[PDB]
C-alpha cells in the first residue's frame, strides 16, 4: 500500500504499541490514529497519512 494513505491493523481500554489507547465505554481515542470496532470485542487501528494490540 503506498504512502500518504491509511493503514488498517487488526477489557475497557485497548492500547496500541509500535501510540494511543481506545476507551470503549465513552468510545474515545489529531486524526492521525483512530480505533474502529468492526465487530463485538474486535478492534482495528486505522492510521491516516501514512504493531501490537495490548
Amino acid at each position: 500500500r503506498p504512502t500518504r494513505s491509511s493503514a488498517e491493523i487488526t477489557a475497557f481500554y485497548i492500547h496500541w504499541y509500535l501510540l494511543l489507547y481506545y476507551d470503549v465505554s465513552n468510545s474515545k481515542d489529531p486524526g492521525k490514529y483512530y480505533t474502529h470496532t468492526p465487530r463485538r470485542w474486535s478492534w482495528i487501528l486505522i492510521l491516516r497519512n501514512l504493531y501490537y494490540c495490548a
Epitope: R4, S6, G31, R48, N49
Partner: T-cell receptor, first 124, second 107 residues
C-alpha cells in the same frame, strides 16, 4: 436555506406538475439542483438551474426560475408512471468562485443545502 | 444498502462512488422527514475530516480502505444517528451521490 413548504403532491400521468421550491441565500451567483430520491433512496440528479442563467430545461424537466422572487420551481411535463419520487430542491454553489463568504473553501468543500423534499404521486 | 447496529456501537457506511479524481467526499444524512444534511466532508488529498459546526470530534471518521474508497464510521451510536447516509462528490454538472445506505440504530 431551502423551503419546500408543500409535500406529497399528487398529479395524474401525462399531465404537468409544478414542484414549488423557494430558497434563502446571500450568494451573488449560485445554482439550484432538482434531484429525485427514488424508493431505493437513490438520489438522482434531474436539472441544474443557475442564478445567472436562463430558465433551465432538460427535455421533460424545466425550471421556472425567478431570481428576484427566489422561485426556482421545477416543472415536469408529460409524466409517466415511473415519475413518483421525493423531489428535492437543493441550493448549492459548486462552480462559483466569487460572491460567497470570505472562507478559503475551494467550492469542492461546499455543501448542497437541501429542502425537506416533496413526494410526488403519479396517479393513473 | 442497510446497516443495522445497536446503540453505543460503531457503524460503517461504504458506498459505490467510483470517482477517481475526487478531492472532497461529503457525507449527507437524510433522516426521512427532514432535509438531507451534511455531517462532514473528507478532504481526500490531505485526508482530513471537517465536521459541521457545533459537533464533537470522534463522532464521525472517514476511512480509506482502498484507493478511491471511503467509509463513514460512527462511534457510540444513538438512535438519532439513524437515517440514510450518502457519499456525495461534486461533478461538473451536478453533485454525484452514492446509492445511500440506511443506518438503523436498534436498542
Amino acid at each position: 436555506k431551502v423551503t419546500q413548504a408543500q409535500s406529497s403532491v399528487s398529479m395524474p400521468v401525462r399531465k404537468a406538475v409544478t414542484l414549488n421550491c423557494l430558497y434563502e441565500t446571500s450568494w451573488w451567483s449560485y445554482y439550484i439542483f432538482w434531484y429525485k430520491q427514488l424508493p431505493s433512496k437513490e438520489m438522482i440528479f434531474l436539472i441544474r438551474q443557475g442564478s445567472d442563467e436562463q430558465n433551465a430545461k432538460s427535455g421533460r424537466y424545466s425550471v421556472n426560475f425567478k431570481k428576484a422572487a427566489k422561485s426556482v420551481a421545477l416543472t415536469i411535463s408529460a409524466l409517466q408512471l415511473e415519475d413518483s419520487a421525493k423531489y428535492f430542491c437543493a441550493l448549492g454553489a459548486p462552480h462559483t468562485y466569487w460572491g460567497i463568504s470570505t472562507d478559503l473553501s475551494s467550492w469542492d468543500t461546499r455543501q448542497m443545502f437541501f429542502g425537506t423534499g416533496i413526494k410526488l404521486f403519479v396517479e393513473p | 444498502k442497510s446497516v443495522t447496529r445497536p446503540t453505543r456501537s460503531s457503524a460503517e457506511i461504504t458506498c459505490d462512488l467510483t470517482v477517481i479524481n475526487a478531492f472532497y467526499i461529503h457525507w449527507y444524512l437524510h433522516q426521512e422527514g427532514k432535509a438531507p444534511q451534511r455531517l462532514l466532508y473528507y478532504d481526500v488529498s490531505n485526508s482530513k475530516d471537517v465536521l459541521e459546526s457545533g459537533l464533537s470530534p470522534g463522532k464521525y471518521y472517514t476511512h480509506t480502505p482502498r484507493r478511491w474508497s471511503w467509509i463513514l464510521i460512527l462511534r457510540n451510536l444513538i438512535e438519532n444517528d439513524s437515517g440514510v447516509y450518502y457519499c456525495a462528490t461534486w461533478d461538473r454538472p451536478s453533485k454525484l451521490f452514492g446509492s445511500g445506505t440506511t443506518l438503523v440504530v436498534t436498542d
